A paper describes a structure:
NbUGT72AY1 is a promiscuous transferase that glycosylates bioactive hydroxycoumarins such as scopoletin and umbelliferone, as well as monolignols involved in lignin formation and various other small molecules. Five distinct GT protein folds have been identified that are capable of GT activity (termed GT-A to GT-E). NbUGT72AY1 adopts a GT-B fold comprised of two distinct N-terminal and C-terminal Rossmann-like domains (shown in cyan and brown in Fig. 2, respectively) of seven and six parallel β-sheets, respectively linked to α-helices, connected by a linker region and an interdomain cleft. The catalytic mechanism of inverting UGT such as NbUGT72AY1 is a direct displacement bimolecular nucleophilic substitution (SN2)-like reaction enabled by an enzymatic base catalyst.
Because addition of retinol to enzyme assays considerably reduces the SI of scopoletin in NbUGT72AY1, crystals grown in (apo)carotenoid-containing solution are expected to represent productive protein complexes. Co-crystallization of NbUGT72AY1 with scopoletin, UDP2FG and retinol yielded seven different structures (A-G), which were grouped into four classes (VI – IX) according to their molecular similarities (VI_A, VI_D, VI_F, VII_E, VII_G, VIII_B, and IX_C). Although retinol and the closing loop between Ser309 and Thr325 were not visible in all structures, the spatial arrangement of helix H2 (Ile42-Leu59), the direction of rotation of Trp350, the orientation of the acceptor substrate, and the number of ligands differed among the four groups. Thus, complex VI (VI_A, VI_D, and VI_F) presumably constitutes the productive ‘Michaelis’ structure, while VII (VII_E and VII_G) represents the precursor complex, which is still lacking the acceptor substrate. Since in VIII (VIII_B) the scopoletin is rotated by 180° in the horizontal axis and thus the distance to His18 increases to 8.3 Å, and in IX (IX_C) the Trp350 adopts a spatial arrangement that differs from all other structures, it is reasonable to assume that both VIII and IX are non-productive structures. Retinol was not resolved in any crystal structure (VI to IX). In all NbUGT72AY1 crystals obtained in solutions with retinol or β-carotene, the amino acid sequence between Ser309 and Asp327 (closing loop) is disordered regardless of whether acceptor and/or donor substrates are present (II, VI-IX). Although all the crystals that formed in the presence of 0.5 mM β-carotene and retinol were clearly different from their (apo)carotenoid-free counterparts (I and V versus II and VI, respectively), the effector molecules were not detectable in the electron density map and are invisible in the 3D structure. In the presence of β-carotene (II) and retinol (VI and VII), the 3D structures are more open and the loop covering the catalytic center is not fully resolved. These latter complexes are actively involved in catalysis as clearly demonstrated by the increase in enzymatic activity after apo/carotenoid addition.
Numbering used by the authors: 6 to 62, 65 to 310, 326 to 477
Write the structure that this text describes.
Amino acid sequence: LHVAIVSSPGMGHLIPVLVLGNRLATHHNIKITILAITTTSSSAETEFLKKTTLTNETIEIIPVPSVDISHLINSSTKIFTQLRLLVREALPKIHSTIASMTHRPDALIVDIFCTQILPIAEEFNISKYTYHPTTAWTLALAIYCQVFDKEIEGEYVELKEPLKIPGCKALRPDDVVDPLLDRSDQQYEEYVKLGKEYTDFDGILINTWEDLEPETINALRYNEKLRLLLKVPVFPIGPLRRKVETTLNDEVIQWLDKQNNESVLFVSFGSGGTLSTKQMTELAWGLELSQQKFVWVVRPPSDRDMSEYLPEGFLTRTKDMGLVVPMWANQVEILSHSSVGGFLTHCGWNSTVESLTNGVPMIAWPLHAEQKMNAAMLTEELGVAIRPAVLPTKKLVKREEIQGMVRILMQTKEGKRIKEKAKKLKKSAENALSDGGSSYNSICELVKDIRSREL
Ligand SMILES: O=c1ccn([C@@H]2O[C@H](COP(=O)(O)OP(=O)(O)O[C@H]3O[C@H](CO)[C@@H](O)[C@H](O)[C@H]3F)[C@@H](O)[C@H]2O)c(=O)[nH]1
Ligand SMILES: COc1cc2ccc(=O)oc2cc1O
């Protein structure tokens, strides 16, 4: 079989598509080709294309150029809509690239943002699926959002009662996805539109697994009110993640090698994440006062060398206790290391999966997208994370609170209890993605669905 997987422009959307491609190719002998939509501008992932042009197995990458869209955006236009327009205007280029395909794919594939390709899948009459690369809960939200639109008048964020998704958990108004923060903003309309677009596909892949969200998945499958909207299968195929590159002369890993087991706290706010000047200074102090060992991936604050935004003397005072790394670090290789025993994270789903597959517990610190609905899940339901009393996005987290949180996770028995839960999650994830595992079984049902359309 041939499948073509379509990726959106940023690295954060490319890598998950690659991991899916690699998984299918290796474990299911299905020839794959990734149509990666590029920015045709920044292109800080186009060099990764060069790096990947070298070891292709299947694993055939086709770059697709975008246009310059500065004419359709404005300082105030938000990222969600940005992505939406980029693809929207890339549509013709996709149409052309699939035409002039050497062997036709037999099956199309869309990332959350590349849903507007459905048109060109129906033309040429090819099997079409979407990849929702985070929680089942957020999927349920997206789909049922079209109903909420009509049921609620006024702004979601001001409600005194939680939002009740048929079958799934109750969503507290504060923990809503970014699109639902303001209904007057175009991203909201795009969001509800996305929710509707999902249902039009022949099936929806989700990088979770049954044991993680049993009720929510069962709701998607069987809840009457929801099934009035959905009407097609769901495929929990996760948790999928990057492979480890057992690394040699990386000084972070060499530092970590000199530390004790589960004694280091990794701090990272994902690709793109940045704090305020005040928040960053309070964080810095928190880590110092904790007297705990850490690796801190730092970028400039939002509201240069990484010492002007840091407390004077910090680096010399924290020498031998912490390790401050600029912009990027090898997260997967860190998290897999024996000496890492905690993760202060923004709760991006890839970060979370990388942490849970490793049995590392977390300090949830949600910033954007659905990170608030993931933080909620991790802390409340799953019990593998702790969080500040008030959301960080609403109020400044001061040094005392931080230093406690870090203390509570890397010293106290409560911390160890949380860790033990994360290990259980790890094991359950392993059992799936294993032969006989529900997630593995989910692809086998996917491949069955694909072959059925071909005959
Ligand atoms: O210093 C670094 C920083 C990142 N990475 C890697 O980049 C990826 C980041 O994805 P992740 O889900 O963790 O966060 P991010 O893309 O920043 O945030 C959104 O990710 C998605 C995009 O909106 C969204 O689904 C999610 O809700 C958001 F959180 C992930 O594979 C990390 O391992 C790294 O190796 N080192
Ligand atoms: C780029 O910012 C994003 C925001 C959202 C919001 C809701 C959601 O389900 O997915 C997202 C994925 C993103 O990549």
